[model samples]
Target: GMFPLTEENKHVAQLLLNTGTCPRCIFRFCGVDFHAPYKLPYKELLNELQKFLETNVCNVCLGILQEFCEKDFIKKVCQKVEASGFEFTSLVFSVSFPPQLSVREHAAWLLVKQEMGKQSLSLGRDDIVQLKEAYKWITHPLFSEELGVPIDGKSLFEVSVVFAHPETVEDCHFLAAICPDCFTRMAVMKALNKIKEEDFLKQFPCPPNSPKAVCAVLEIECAHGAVFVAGRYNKYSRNLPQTPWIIDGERKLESSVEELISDHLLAVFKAESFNFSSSGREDVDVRTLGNGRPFAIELVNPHRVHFTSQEIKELQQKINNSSNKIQVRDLQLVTREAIGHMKEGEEEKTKTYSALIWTNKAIQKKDIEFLNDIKDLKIDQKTPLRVLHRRPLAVRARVIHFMETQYVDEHHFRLHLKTQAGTYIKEFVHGDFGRTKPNIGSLMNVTADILELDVESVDVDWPPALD
Candidate 1:
């Protein structure tokens, strides 16, 4: 006989067992630990459970354990896992039981409480291990062996069983009264109602029909997290924007360099979304040339993740061919840790710029020839009024590392300047209405204005030039 099984306890156990429940479920009703080694045969366990009741034939939880070990079901789950195309080393399992299962569990808890009253038993609703836990314990060992991975509860690859019981509507009626809002709405607040379990069952009786289990694989949801793709891009068109241009919710551009690169990547990665970032950004009217600007895209929730070197090269060609306005080069898949290198010394980086300047007065080679003599010249720049609405009104100190002048005409010349990364070349050239102190216009004693600007090169040896 079981330890606490008195005459009254026997009756309750017999009632549950007679309902076509198995020995494991009878152990649950009688508040016994059923996690013992299953090496003991089912009938042997049943014989031990029935010793107190002397019952002829009893059944409870008819196929609960059996359903967990079903070969077809496990095979189907394994097929779904393999078909997802996500490479994973470990896995976790979860299950959703029919609503009637909750009803049955609470009823068993209540019956056990009534039978064990005044006995000072350690049995409570919380004391029982969940059906899902028991099922996983029994099934994961074999599932792991078949899948060739160990079961790790924290693994990103989660296999879930979403069960449905469309026919067990009446069994959930008591739940309707307890959680009116959740009962009507399938899954709302149902798990949150656990604290009120005993109180709810105290007022209502259990449903006469036992819970029936039917499940299907809803989703595997192999979380791959975010993957980064790093590369350099050249913008040939000055009219192209770094990103979507909008003024007060109205789009100002038809397309942009960011979209040109990200659209192809989002599709190729099969990602949910993306975040596009660069080492630095140029204005809509500024073109990035030379080796182009170093940039990286963080792909969010991508379904397909693995990328080979040749595959990455093909992706780069696809982007380059997609548009004549922008071209991507040296594109490669990078680890999340490598993204920091792009902005490692953002302010310390140097950039070369070519500006077409027009002077109010005629200028010769000698007038600007002294410009090259000035090395590491620092200038104080107040934010230009043209970008004041978007930029804060602050003074910035920038340097002109070196300068070289190619005389185009007296008033128009190609100015090649190698400056600190954040130097406002347009402001420095035209003086920005006297905002930039000691500018080229001031040095040459002429009103110099730039007609066009192009970023020749951004000096950051990042992503290590893919061979």
Candidate 2:
């Protein structure tokens, strides 16, 4: 399940805070025990914080004593990432604090803004007003001079927390403090407070550190998707399968697809669990082409590691070095949102193929042109009799977007196709007994058969890389 929140979490969060030493300690403390096997409700956790604020003196609120931590954290991370000299389109944050810590952090940050906006007085002023006033106190001329604030000023940033092992929320106190906009914003805000907000936000009007490029700092509301890492496979021989080697009787290979990728990635990311999706499955006899098929490898409960481009490349190279049959390429760090594009049009996406076709009857060069003009031909097809036992009986119409033919010999030819994703190339080549409408066999007026098949490429534009 993706971010399954429940009511039990709210109660758990409250119990942790009530038992904490104080609000500040709760926010800063690192070791909060996971009482259950799942994450508590994030929304409900915040509710617990809200309830505590009415009269409780928990550690989070008392320590940071302000709700601006979210924005502060964002600004810090963003500034660091921007200065890191890496070109990336987007970024997200992940955090893990104890349940008490998370709720306190959230409530502190949220309550600060809420109390300020509603003009609810606390300590003689609304939260925002108090924040502004408190910041002033922190950055007062005397304090600033001691804290080493220069004559100039500081600014603020916005950031949000996401639960990485949202499901394991009960096991660990964690949050993905994410989204660059929010992360940077909050970091900037904190930096400003340190540098003197009066001078930074008002007088200088420039960023706290980045005086040139100014980016928006926003907040991440909640923890998003769970992670699923792929497992490792030590192929002892050329034909040892990475996944289940299901043939006539399912012999040696006993692991499932869920097991292989999951085990490898879990160790790589050091995650507790994960989810996996791939371009397609390959038969044991065939090897995946062009760095294997695309896959989304999620790491459930990660031990806190942000993969850099260098790291990703190294990981890909490592996978290649360790295996003989499969190799992964265009390996990259991706967001849950980016992975969706991989499956967005699974049925509609196009794929190109190169196949070796053999015929029982002798053929000629003129036969090559017979398929060259079949660029956009539409064919009616019924489910082939070969796999009728496993397939449903249906006659469907499909299109061949484009095809090119080259004569390999008298009886065989090399066929290339740029067609719809789901088009069964073998069926189209052999006519699938009319199951693959207007098949090559029917068009060529010969008994055509596929000698060999290979998927050349999967046309998916994501993570922005060259083939």
Candidate 3:
């Protein structure tokens, strides 16, 4: 016989046994510490339990303890885990019980409270050890040994069990009048609040003789599936958009740089979806040449996470082959912390652009020769009319680092300029109706418009190149 079984606990065990409660439930009712003695042989534990009460096999739970300890259930659980292709170093176990079990336990609590009057035994429904906790205590070591990893509550892999009673719903039937709408769905406090303690004890005199709840694995969900992959992309075609271009709920382009890159990523990672972000954006009419633009995509719920450097290089090649309008380079998986480097000095960063400027009047090489002499030329730029809807109206002071001119012809000359990252090159060339001060038109004493613009380079070292 177990040495911890006192005379008072023996009486309560006999009362629970007469109602066909399982040995585990008897241990729970008497507030027994289940960890130490639970590892003993099942038959020997049952024989020791009989020393307290002349009991029969539990009709309410139908020997659920024995069923849980059986190797067949453990095998089935392990088989299901193997079927799901998730690589994990640790896992956690959770269980769901039918509503009737709570009601029976509540009834047992009332009985114990009434019999132990003035004894100061402060036991209640919440005080009882949860079956789920007890089950994990008994089986965590077995599961860890079988899975070759520790089973802890902090693990991202979660194994869940959903148990139901198909035969009888009578154990929870007394709540029909107390809470007609949510009789079975009410929690412990709400159910206890609706009925008095005395009425609750009188309502359900005996525990219902229901079969053990049948449990099945609902799902094995995994978290921490999000991964970040960084790279640079070059847009060759001027018609290509950085992201989906839509106006008045209508698409402007068939494909974009975002779609071109994310499509291959979604397929490769078997991910649910993706969020595309970049250091800056290029308009549909602009071409990003030279080193391209820095970008990263957050892959959501990716099923396959691990990829070697060689495999990533092959993936980049696949993306390049998928489209002729766009090209990608330096594609590699990155940590979440590295994505911030792309936007660290966004306003202070420098960008070089080559613009084909068309002047209203014929201009000679000498007319724009003074343009190259201006170093760190300061200019006040108001929000451009073309982007006023998206950008706030404010005057931004920007500096042009240096400028160089190419003698194309009389009306047209190519201008290569390096300036602050957010400087509007198009507005700087045409003056944006005098919103941008001292523009090329004002400086050269003639009207000017950009015929074409190409980003020569964006100066930011990020996402260390992985070969």
Candidate 4:
């Protein structure tokens, strides 16, 4: 009754059930597709399923699917899921039993290979289902129903139930001679089909003896989904690089923005490591102000996944508390897709910067007042001398959207600029020795240079700010 066995399959089911195969596997061998039968009492069906070796070790699934249909085993299965502490809309329940299953299932296949060849077409080849899908059909329903999610083959999250076969090392010992690489489970599967069946029976029995279940092995694997943490960072150190800085195996700075954030994020997420990305980077000498710059860290395979916004805020404080050179705000766990907004239109955006400008000659308010009236001033910039080694000598056209100046003294002025993203601010101010044309030096007819710079804001709306 565990299977909807037709007249054609009735005799085959009886034979497989009586010959050390379990009741659920009988459903598998019948090529049946339904859930209730798999959940049906495996004990009662196995008693009528022509019995067991008092242990009922399934020759096909190596004692796994034998009592694997029992309520006790199903209880054990669900217990692991609850204990795994993962969150998901739905999850894939997977099974990966060892190579003892490899030999047993194939031996079952071999034993029945000749049974359906010509006897009134009692059963077909497809009836003998492999254990993977069969186990999924049997085990996924109870798990999904109990966990309150739909059962399916695809999910970003996966919980695999693994079993170890006690006596599989010898199964492939003979095949190891035939194939150059034949010891591992993977090589066994390849040799299973790739080799001849006549040669297969020479080493393996027509149907191997049932492997004893040692209450079976239970190992659970949770391939935890990737978690992305986003925030805006204020970098206030002139010595800090945006990333680890080393030159020709020589150390430069003691630490950097990437290392500073990840030092806490990798630990808090209980993740192995992280990848750091930001909207754009500032020079080591420059400081990021206003709301700071957008950044995110992809934490791979985190052991812990849940956190309330309050806890996230506490972590924000933890990072903020750890250092004074950098302060992070808008700390949040966001979607991977949402993080793309940080750089999606990187070149098609605007930025605000306040650069400290210096002129070779004395400059008064009237001398730089002409800077205020310029709007959307176009400039041509070749790669600056500082960046020429890293870049090819390519000329690029860029727009200086607006400029306003604050006079500091005769020789120093504070230049506030709104420019298209990727415009070289230093080159725009100093003319980069004619690498930049029509710069402040060109317009004011004097030598000009930049002393310091600060990023006011990167004008991309992303990673919503904290309330």
Candidate 5:
């Protein structure tokens, strides 16, 4: 008789027969649940694999094998990634499906392995057979790395893969490759095996727009065990925040400049892991202008991607094409060594600024000269009372490197200057209730404060940006 449906054995068979629904959805659905053998006792894991192999149809779609299952893919992808370049503690992958691929949609809890076992022959590493050029059976190809992630073996890391929803996988697959999932793994594996470990680690995806399963691998290369990406950005719109904002415990913002930049970067480069960074930051109300404030985005576990000069320019154009408000520049992919230059002199690396200053009294050339000449001025800042709730109450010292002034009219002037990376330009003008010393107020001996400020430049050479 067919296997009896006893409560205990039925549960076991159900788990063993993991049904992976759509042929294209296997990679996207496999790795999410906690199914690692090492996470459980050796005996328990082997026994589970054994029992599942024997009975119970996978609850979701069909069932898959324990040998070449999705968990194995994660291990293989990571090993290939590690063998290539860089290192990281944490990483994330983005996957999605569009409406046209609705035929493959399954419950979020469904695993794709169950289906693979029932249809095609048992899968192998080099399992190749002639396949028809149908759009429905396709898998998307992946890229190998992200440009800004730093890589080296001595670093530790973590990784996450966000697959396209089952519903959308088919459309994504059609746009990208004849078989993206299998093709990407095969390509990345070959690329990683071809190079020496040291040199291979620094490469990210060369061509940025190929529809592939690319990843950006970032290393845990810093004190935070993270490699950060540094670049400058312009905020043309006020609705966006530098980071995602939470409104009363829920997200108030749609997304962030960081997410957009990171996502686009990974898609083109085929990176496995990474994150973003900046010299300082602007409030959601502020705008960054000029060359944009210098920042970094750290990639965790890079696979096969590397950048060329032309591709870097294309990357910038891609970012510009997506959004008008935020413009990035001086974008160079750097190693961990380059990131050290961010604050070589500590609080002394020079930064430039441009601000539209408004004043109660009429201004003149002398007023502009006074501000410009007040170089090497020190400001003692108390944590702005506005931020005291989150920041420690401490007095910090910063210096204004210099300033340039432009007269818009008798009552206002445009100021620009190069100063240290950490200078508090806002309080320097207002004096912060004596918290910021020798400020614009002290230099001018008049009541002066910033009306609107823009960061003009962050002088770091790590990311060699295009004009």
Candidate 6:
């Protein structure tokens, strides 16, 4: 009555139980997909399965179905989840059972294959409800009621249980000897298919001689998914690199723009670590100004995730107050998908820069007037020498969208340039030993050099501004 099976399905269930398959696994092979049947009292199911279900270890599914489903066994697994100290509303559950279970299931499948077909039931190997699914279902209500967290398809928190059967570990060893050089569980599965059914029967028994012991819970690991925070940053210090600059493990600078921001987030979130990226990077000597530059941080496995928007705003304020070297604004938690928007606009973006330039030849405002007439002037750049190792050495066409010059004196002036993103502004001004053609020197009829630079705007409207 627990199963409510047809006569044909009942026959298949009996065939498996008599062959030493566990009761729940008998339900599995008989296509009993409903949760109620599996969750019903073991005493009543045993009556329907009848008397032959007293094996020490199941021939199929080892004792995973028979033994591991007990409340005591699941409570032990739940204890590990509690010990992990991750605060989460819901969790995604997963499990890995021994590969030997597959071999044994194959044997049981052969025993009931004909009867399964005669019942007009379509059974693909995968259609057989997996051990992980059954384990999740039987344990679902208990885990949900006990842990106070619903099982979700996707959640920020994850709990993994791995089961190992040490006593029956050799169940697949014979396959290794036959398949020669086969090592992984996947390799054993491959050997099962490449190998003839009769060849397998000659070595391993059908109904797979009952395992001597049940599967043991090997480990339970819990993890909270990465948390993403997006913001725009202004780097006031020219001495700091955007990220840590290390060569041969030697520290190049005392601190960086990335570390300054991450130090506060890492501590508050209690995250294990972090990964940081900006819409575009600034050189160590370049200062970021204007509305700052878009950036995002990925905090890995943070112990705490609940944060009010005001709390996030306070963190941003704390970072801003921490140092004059860098400042962050509009700092808030963002979706994983939204963070990618910063990169998508990388090459398509336009950037405005303010660069202090020195000219070798003296010139008055009247003499420098020709620069104001140029619009979207195209220049060829044969990769600057400093970055040739990391980038391909080839001529690249770059556009300088517009230009304006503020005359200071004969030798010095401030240059405001709006150019396509990725244009080498310094090389465009100083010419990188003439690598960038039609540059400042070539156009102005004098030797030019960039004395200082500041990013006026990055021009990507992302990581929306916080009020």
| Candidate 5 structure quality by residue, lDDT tens digits, 1-467 | 12112333333233333332222222223221212222333245445544544552222222212211234444554565555454333333323212222212222122122334554424332222111111111211111233223333353343333222232233333423333332243343443344443332223221111222222222312122334345667776666788778889898977777776677776555465666666566766567676666667776544423567677777877887888768777666666655565545234456777777767677776776766566676667888877889879998877777777877887778888777666767777777887777766666666776788776665655445656
Candidate-wise lDDT, in order: 0.73, 0.48, 0.75, 0.78, 0.49, 0.82
In candidate 5, where is summed lDDT lowest over 10 consecutive residues?
131-140
Q: Per-residue CA lDDT of candidate 4, range 1-467, in tens?
A: 53366667666576676677777777787777766666666667656545332316777776666566455676677777778666667777777677656776777776665566546455555666667776766677767777787765667677777777656656767776666554456778888867777777887876666655533565866676788988899989877999989987886877899888879887777787888999888889999999998899998877677899999999999899899889999999998875669886366679899999888998788999988989998899998899989889988899888898999999999999999988989888889889899798999888998899999988877888888
Off by over 4 Å in 3: 1-21, 25-45, 52-70, 92-118, 123-127, 152-158, 164-224, 246-251, 300-303, 336-352, 364-384, 387-409, 413-424, 434-445, 457-461
Q: Candidate 4: what lDDT?
A: 0.78
Model 3 has an lDDT value of 0.75
- Output the lDDT of residue 328, model 3: 90
Instruction: Give the clash total for candidate 3.
Output: 0
Q: How big is the positional error of residue 141 in model 1, measured in Å on the Cα after superposition?
A: 3.9
TM-scores for all candidates: the values are 0.68, 0.49, 0.74, 0.78, 0.48, 0.94
Model 1: lowest-lDDT 10 consecutive positions: 55-64
RMSD of each predicted structure: 6.1, 18.0, 5.1, 4.7, 19.6, 2.6
- Per-residue lDDT over 97-209 for candidate 1, one digit per residue giving the tens place of the 0 to 100 score: 56566665655666666656745555666766566666666678767877899998777567676655555546566555665666433352363355375666565454233
TM-score winner: 6
Error at 279, model 4, angstroms? 1.9
Give the least accurate 10-residue stretch of model 4, judged by summed lDDT.
46-55
Candidate 2: lDDT over CA atoms?
Answer: 0.48
Give the per-residue lDDT of model 2 (tens digit) for 49-111. 556544332333232223223344435444544443332222333332323233334334343
Clashing pairs in 6: none
TM-score of 6: 0.94
Rank the candidate models, highest lDDT first. Answer: 6, 4, 3, 1, 5, 2
The per-residue C-alpha lDDT of model 3 at residue 410 equals 91
The top-ranked prediction according to lDDT is 6
